[PDB]
Design a protein around this ligand. Structure first.
Ligand SMILES: CC(=O)N[C@@H]1[C@@H](O)[C@H](O)[C@@H](CO)O[C@H]1O
Ligand SMILES: *[C@@H]1O[C@H](CO)[C@@H](O)[C@H](O)[C@H]1NC(C)=O
Ligand SMILES: *[C@@H]1O[C@H](CO)[C@@H](O)[C@H](O)[C@H]1NC(C)=O
Ligand SMILES: *[C@@H]1O[C@H](CO)[C@@H](O)[C@H](O)[C@H]1NC(C)=O
Lengths: 218, 193, 213
């Protein structure tokens, strides 16, 4: 089965550089024109570049022309985006795309999950994690506040992935400071409190921050 | 009696010429849309279980003079060494295009030794793709600017065919009577103009 | 990347919705249109290519048509699972590049209206002891999506210092949203009460919390 895994994204300073990698499996890499499409948070699709199966034709968007280089290594099943002179507005999720060379089905018959590129003068900041204690016709709400982080993303689980009913993790807020905050709430039964232990697992991989926080009744 | 008929590919029910639909092209002079020759059309489509085309039924296209859209040939009968069934095609319009901007696309036909587009006088728009035809000759000298009615630049993707030196060495070049505009194949009836 | 699309389209289960895509002769007037579905958090998937053809594995309720420089995507037999953003795309001869549309947010309706659940969380003790404070208003299980969020200290309005998320889908296919009032511990001790007010389809739900308890 086909698979495209992107990698190499992260936080980087304007005017800096990064190299994105797309590792391909589940098809003959050499038969496919590969492309890069990006998406700013909460915004539309933007095609970046396309290279053909043999690096014989290469196309770019005017916006990146002279700053990004696409390349490929068919022997390694790897697409490349060398990104130089990065601008804040290059902040985006970068998707890797494939379509059979001169096939009918395309362009971009398959996309990977994307790698996130953040371009900012701001430095890394791990989050403060804080319990949201319940009180408890009523049910009970409880959760975790993930305060003041940069850059994205943060994942949150409950009791190492055991608990998933009633859980909701919110998209983050961008505060005036340039930091991010979000919340993961779990709605639980009225009588569930005081017995069942609830721990949110907060993971901010950019800063290597891992926090488990037990949320107890007030 | 000029007769226009609908083609394949984009904007059409049919994605490729195949046995199911080939007889719909009988006596067409103008194609409204495109012609596509995919591998599934020529050898058989397993998902609709369509039979492999009869190579002699490709002779229907000798009546074609105009193709409004694009020509996309990606599979051809191994014993048909040129596209002489399109000897009467004069105009490719490229009102609709294939992939990233092409009106003409001849690809990976291991057995075609010349093109044979004898009547071809105009490609009104689009880019030209001729690649991986490992045996193709006579196209090296051809004056695409004549046919494209415009600058050749940023319109040619002509790679990886038979190497020019190899064609020259085996005498697979234009007849001396042909212009410097070139030929579509061997001998004097094949000159571009 | 200037293909014109409607920002938004809606329908109820089993309806037929159309999303239009306007371009130019150099892009979708010449070259083919493709269409993509992107569900939230996920990678786009090709839906329609070369104006009207569907990948195998793409159901035939999705259909595409084109005439001149305007293209239409149709979703007959609308489903809850079709709620997504939709992008048209075209190669542009003039640019030697691909040109995407802005995207259309497709919403699937038909569900009963449901009023929002609201839980307002005071600053935690942990947070307070680190000399900071946040009120966390959590808004749950409403339909349809839109809400408006107002804050009050001691009945007077608080506007600056407020940050609110766009509503997004819950596991149970209802909406949730979040809003935050940031506060210094001094201004948290100093007022008698703080309030979070959520207006959903014209009707406000309020929740209130007190530093004293
Ligand atoms: C020159 C010409 O048109 N000849 C044939 C005609 O004999 C035949 O009946 C027709 C079918 O429409 O196909 C063509
Ligand atoms: C070209 O078309 C004419 C009819 O217009 C036909 O008689 C002739 O045989 C065709 N030539 C070729 C080489 O197909
Ligand atoms: C076409 O080239 C093939 C190589 O795949 C070769 O076997 C054969 O000689 C050619 N076929 C014909 C019909 O000449
Ligand atoms: C075209 O190919 C056939 C065999 O497929 C051959 O007999 C004929 O001579 C070729 N035509 C030209 C003009 O070379």
């Amino acid at each position: 089965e086909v698979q495209l895994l992107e990698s190499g994204g992260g936080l980087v300073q304007p005017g800096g550089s990064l190299r994105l990698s797309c590792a391909a499996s589940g098809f003959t890499f050499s038969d496919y024109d590969m492309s890069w499409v990006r998406q700013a948070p909460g915004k539309g699709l933007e095609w970046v570049s396309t290279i053909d199966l043999d690096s014989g034709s290469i196309y770019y968007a005017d916006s990146v022309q002279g700053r990004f280089t696409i390349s490929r290594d068919n022997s390694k099943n790897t697409l490349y985006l060398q990104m130089n002179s990065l601008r804040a507005e290059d902040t985006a999720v970068y998707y890797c795309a494939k379509d059979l060379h001169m096939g009918p089905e395309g362009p971009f018959d398959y996309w990977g999950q994307g790698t996130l590129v953040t371009v900012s003068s701001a430095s890394t900041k791990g989050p403060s994690v804080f319990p949201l204690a319940p009180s408890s016709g009523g049910t009970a709400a409880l959760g975790c506040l993930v305060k003041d982080y940069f850059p994205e993303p943060v994942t949150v689980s409950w009791n190492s992935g055991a608990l998933t009913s009633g859980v909701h993790t919110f998209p983050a807020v961008l505060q005036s400071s340039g930091l991010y905050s979000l919340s993961s709430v779990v709605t639980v039964p009225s009588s569930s409190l005081g017995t069942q232990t609830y721990i949110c697992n907060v993971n901010h991989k950019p800063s290597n921050t891992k926090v488990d926080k037990k949320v107890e009744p007030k | 009696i000029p007769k226009a008929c609908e083609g394949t590919g984009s904007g059409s029910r049919f994605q490729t010429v195949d046995s199911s639909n080939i007889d719909g092209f009988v006596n067409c002079t103008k194609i409204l849309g495109n012609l596509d020759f995919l591998i599934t059309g020529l050898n058989g489509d397993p998902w609709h279980k369509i039979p492999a085309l009869d190579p002699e039924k490709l002779n229907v296209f000798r009546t074609v003079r105009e193709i409004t859209g694009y020509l996309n040939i990606q599979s051809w009968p191994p014993h048909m060494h040129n596209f002489s069934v399109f000897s009467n095609l004069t105009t490719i319009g490229g009102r609709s295009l294939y992939n990233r901007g092409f009106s003409l696309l001849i690809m990976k036909n291991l057995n075609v030794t010349s093109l044979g587009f004898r009547s071809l006088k105009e490609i009104s728009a689009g880019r030209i793709y001729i690649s991986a035809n490992r045996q193709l000759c006579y196209h090296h000298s051809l004056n695409w600017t004549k046919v494209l009615r415009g600058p050749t630049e940023e319109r040619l993707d002509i790679k990886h065919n038979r190497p020019r030196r190899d064609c020259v060495a085996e005498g697979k070049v234009c007849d001396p009577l042909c212009s410097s505009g070139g030929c579509w194949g061997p001998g004097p009836g094949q000159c571009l103009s | 990347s200037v293909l014109t699309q409607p920002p938004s389209a809606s329908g109820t289960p089993g309806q037929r919705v159309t999303i239009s895509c306007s371009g130019s002769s150099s892009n979708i007037g010449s070259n083919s249109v493709s269409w993509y579905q992107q569900l939230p958090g996920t990678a786009p998937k090709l839906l329609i290519y070369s104006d009207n053809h569907r990948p195998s594995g793409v159901p035939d309720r999705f259909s595409g048509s084109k005439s001149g420089t305007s293209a239409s995507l149709a979703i007959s037999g609308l489903r809850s699972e079709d709620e997504a953003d939709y992008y048209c795309q075209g190669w542009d001869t003039s640019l030697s590049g691909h040109v995407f549309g802005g995207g259309t947010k497709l919403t699937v309706l038909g569900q009963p209206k449901a009023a929002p659940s609201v839980t307002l969380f005071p600053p935690s003790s942990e947070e307070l002891q680190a000399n900071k404070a946040t009120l966390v208003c959590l808004i749950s299980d409403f339909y349809p999506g839109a809400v408006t969020v107002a804050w009050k200290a001691d009945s007077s309005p608080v506007k600056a210092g407020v940050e609110t998320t766009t509503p997004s889908k819950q596991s149970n296919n209802k909406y949730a949203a979040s809003s935050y009032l940031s506060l210094t511990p001094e201004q948290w001790k100093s007022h008698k009460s703080y309030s979070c007010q959520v207006t959903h389809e014209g009707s406000t739900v309020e929740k209130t919390v007190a530093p004293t308890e």
